[PDB]
Structures are given as structure tokens and as C-alpha cells.
Amino acid sequence: GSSGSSGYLKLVRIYTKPKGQLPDYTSPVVLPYSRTTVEDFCMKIHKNLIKEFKYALVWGLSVKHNPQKVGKDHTLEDEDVIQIVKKSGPSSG
Numbered sequence: 001g002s003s004g005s006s007g008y009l010k011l012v013r014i015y016t017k018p019k020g021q022l023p024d025y026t027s028p029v030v031l032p033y034s035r036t037t038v039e040d041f042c043m044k045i046h047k048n049l050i051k052e053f054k055y056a057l058v059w060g061l062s063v064k065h066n067p068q069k070v071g072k073d074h075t076l077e078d079e080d081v082i083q084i085v086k087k088s089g090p091s092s093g
Contacts, residue, residue: 012036012078016045017057023081031076039072041082049084057083 010033017023029044038056042049050072057067058074059081067083076082 009033010078012076012080014041014076015079015081016041017081017083019083019085023083036076037072038070038074038076038082041076042072042084045084052086054085054087056085 011030012033013028013030015023015025015028029041031040031044038053039050042053053072056070056074058070058076059066060077060079062075062077062080063070
């Protein structure tokens with residue numbers, strides 16, 4: 001009944017791909033299944049990343065044809081690589 005204790009709470013790992021650099025495969029991010037989404041990861045790195053986050057390139061079964069452009073409403077899966085890109089333009093102050 002009244003849920004609350006641990007149980008079917010799975011954990012999915014996401015391999016971030018920092019532009020220019022290679023995607024870390026030893027220091028991935030373990031996100032709670034219950035909550036799995038691009039907008040969910042952006043937070044892990046920064047609480048104001050989603051503001052710059054333009055799109056993400058998922059690489060794996062999650063998508064049929066990769067790389068594939070995804071938004072913040074996209075669902076992340078275990079053992080998946082995501083390349084967080086930051087908008088490119090003139091920023092005032």
C-alpha cells in the first residue's frame with residue numbers, strides 16, 4: 001500500500017559528451033529511473049544549464065537513427081550517451 005520504501009527504483013547511467021572532449025565512461029551520471037529526462041540531467045550539471053541547452057544528440061537504442069536531435073522532454077535510458085550543446089550567439093553582459 002502506502003509507497004515510500006525502496007523497491008522497483010531502477011537507476012540509469014548517462015554518458016555526457018562535452019563538446020571537443022570525449023564522453024566520460026567511468027564517471028557517468030546515475031539518474032533515478034522514476035525521473036529520466038534531458039531536462040533532468042541538465043540540472044545535475046548546472047541548475048541553470050537548461051537555459052543554454054539547445055539540443056542533445058542521443059546515441060543508442062533510445063533512437064532509431066543517431067545521432068538524433070532531442071529536446072528537454074526526451075526520455076533518457078541506461079547506457080546512453082548525450083552531447084549537451086550550448087547555443088551560439090552574441091550574449092549581452
